[PDB]
Amino acid sequence: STHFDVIVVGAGSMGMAAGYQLAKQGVKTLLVDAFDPPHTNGSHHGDTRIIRHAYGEGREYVPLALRSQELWYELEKETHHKIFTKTGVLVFGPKGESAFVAETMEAAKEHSLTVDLLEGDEINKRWPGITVPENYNAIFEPNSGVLFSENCIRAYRELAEARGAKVLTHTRVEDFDISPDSVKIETANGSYTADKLIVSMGAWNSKLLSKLNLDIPLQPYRQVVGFFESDESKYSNDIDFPGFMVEVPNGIYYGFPSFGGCGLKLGYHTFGQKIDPDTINREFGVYPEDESNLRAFLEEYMPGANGELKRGAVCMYTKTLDEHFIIDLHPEHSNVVIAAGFSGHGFKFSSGVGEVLSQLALTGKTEHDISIFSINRPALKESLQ
């Protein structure tokens, strides 16, 4: 017997930020999640996430990245949970052979971002512990860094709940009933109605958007990360070892300095197993590639960080065909907002995305330019049933 102004289905990275933005404005909000966020079944665990401003995936993301950065600094002041450490982020690759490095550089010039350019031995000299070939170049961004993702979601949840948002946990939404002036969700624990709906189910968008008559290629991937015992005199955040995202011959890798001796953390971005979010094996090490793809990079480029494996985590990406996000109104229902396909690089924007989703749900528009995320773009290959 409780109607809400807005219902958010999937209270993870994007949904919880939207919840916070809505509650902050006195909008009566219900957030429904299959688990109890933050948790380890979706796409936000593993402790840390890189935030970069000069953007190799595309200079068009810079404004949202800068706005999200300002929002993370705001969240830091609002909660007791740790949000952001300014490790700086290093990007490198073989000279003239990395579109990612090249666009990162173009993006920095175009938006007058503060960065250092260096190459070859200068990289190895500046950061003891990194060993790249002399034909590599790099762009270092000193003011970007690392977000503590589970902390972000927990903080947004606590702040939203304090302002009246309701969070219904361990409740899987199974179907939707959309009409011109209201929305309704169906779950085993009951059904709920509101004026607006935000759909942000992460990897499960690939299985449940068809319940909203949408047919968009969204492929979930199993992506692991490992924490390794390292030489702390070289890889500690305390001695300014940076976060990094780099391109080598076999693909892109990303990583984090050791924080409080937790060990250097590394992930291989280019490869992952195609999986289903309900049958993915969440145990690290069950595939030999889990650990060997990581050590292959470490022994070659960060040799002092290739010690004993201290911890592993398994998490998921949800890729669109062009690897750009989907943030838009449902093409047939202006009272339904969709947030999907973050393709392994959406967390850093979740604060800004929460803002965009709030604006779309409340007004049908946003002050942000989000055309590159249009649900109607051809490169997406979208359609209705």
Binding positions for Cl ion, rule: CB under 5 A: 43, 317-318, 342, 344
**Residue 252 contacts by C-beta under 8 Å, 6 or more apart in sequence?**
100, 245, 246, 268, 269, 270
Exactly one of 6, 7, 10, 68 binds ligand FAD (CB under 6 A); which one?
Answer: 10
**Cα angle at 69 between 369 and 150, to 5 degrees?**
110
Please report whether residue 284 would count as binding ligand FAD according to CB under 6 A. Answer: no
Using the contact rule CB under 6 A, the part of the chain among 35-43, 53-61, 131-139, 212-220 near ligand FAD is 35-43
| The one segment of 3-11, 19-27, 85-93, 121-129 that binds ligand FAD by CB under 6 A | 3-11
**101 assigned binding-site residue:** no
- Structure-token pair, residue 221: 């991937």
Q: Is 337 annotated as a binding residue?
A: no
Of the listed 44, 45, 67, 319, which one is catalytic? 45
Could you say which of Cl ion, ligand FAD, none residue 241 binds, taking C-beta under 5 to 8 angstroms by partner kind?
Answer: none
Whose tokens are 């949840």? That residue is 157
- 222 touches, from ligand FAD, Cl ion, none (C-beta below 5 to 8 Å by class): none
Q: 93 or 344, CB closer to Cl ion?
A: 344
Binding residue for ligand FAD, selected from 197, 212, 302, 316, defined by CB under 6 A = 316
Closest contact distance (angstroms) between CB of 155 and ligand FAD is: 14
Asked about 265 being catalytic, the answer comes back as yes
Report the distance separating Cα 281 and Cα 283, nearest Å: 6
What is the rounded distance in angstroms from the CA atom of residue 233 to the CA atom of residue 218? 42
Per-residue DSSP letter, 46: S
Does the annotation count 295 as an active-site position?
no
Site string for ligand FAD, 78-117 (x = CB under 6 A): ----------------------------------------
| 269 classed as catalytic | yes
Judged by CB under 6 A, the stretch of 68-76, 82-90, 197-205, 370-378 that binds ligand FAD is 197-205
Long-range contacts of 15-18 (CB under 8 A, 24+ apart): 15/198, 15/200, 15/339, 16/153, 16/156, 16/157, 16/160, 16/354, 17/152, 17/156, 17/350, 17/351, 17/353, 17/354, 17/355, 17/357, 18/198, 18/200, 18/339, 18/353, 18/354, 18/357, 18/358, 18/361
Q: Is 315 a catalytic residue?
A: yes
Is 212 annotated in a binding site? The answer is no
Which residue from 7, 9, 139, 294 is in contact with ligand FAD, where contact means CB under 6 A?
A: 9
**Is 193 assigned a catalytic role?**
no
Residue 21 interacting with ligand FAD (CB under 6 A): no
DSSP state string for 200-260: --GGGHHHHGGGGTEE---EEEEEEEEEE---HHHHBGGGTPPEEEEEETTEEEEEE-BST
CB of 28 to ligand FAD, least distance (A): 19
Ramachandran angles phi, psi of 337, nearest 5°:
-110, 135
Tokens standing for residue 243? 């976060």
Select 101 or 245, whichever has its Cβ closest to ligand FAD: 245
Instruction: Record the tokens describing residue 328, joined without a space.
Output: 């838009």
Active site residue 87: no
Annotated binding site: 5-35
Annotated binding site for FAD: 5-35
As annotated, the active-site residues are: 45, 48-49, 265, 269, 315, 348
